[PDB]
């Protein structure tokens, strides 16, 4: 909204730029995690701490 355009002239470039649509477990299945994947590409600064 323009009201949070005005107070997002106050908070941040990345302060309220986000909203939740996280990839979750589908409804009904429930297991455990056995394998995770790591894939990163040279340019844009892998995190630390971490």
């Amino acid at each position: 909204t323009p009201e949070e355009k005005l107070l997002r002239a106050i908070f941040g470039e990345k302060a309220s730029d986000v909203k939740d649509s996280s990839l979750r477990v589908p409804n009904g299945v429930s297991g455990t995690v056995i394998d995770v994947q790591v894939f990163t590409r040279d340019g844009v600064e892998k995190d630390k701490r971490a």
């Binding site: 730029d17 990839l23 297991g31 995690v33």
Partner: peptide, 14 residues
């Protein structure tokens, strides 16, 4: 989106 996507394998006891 923002903050990332990772491939995750799930194992369910059938």
């Amino acid at each position: 989106g923002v903050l990332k996507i990772v491939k995750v394998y799930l194992a369910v006891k059938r």
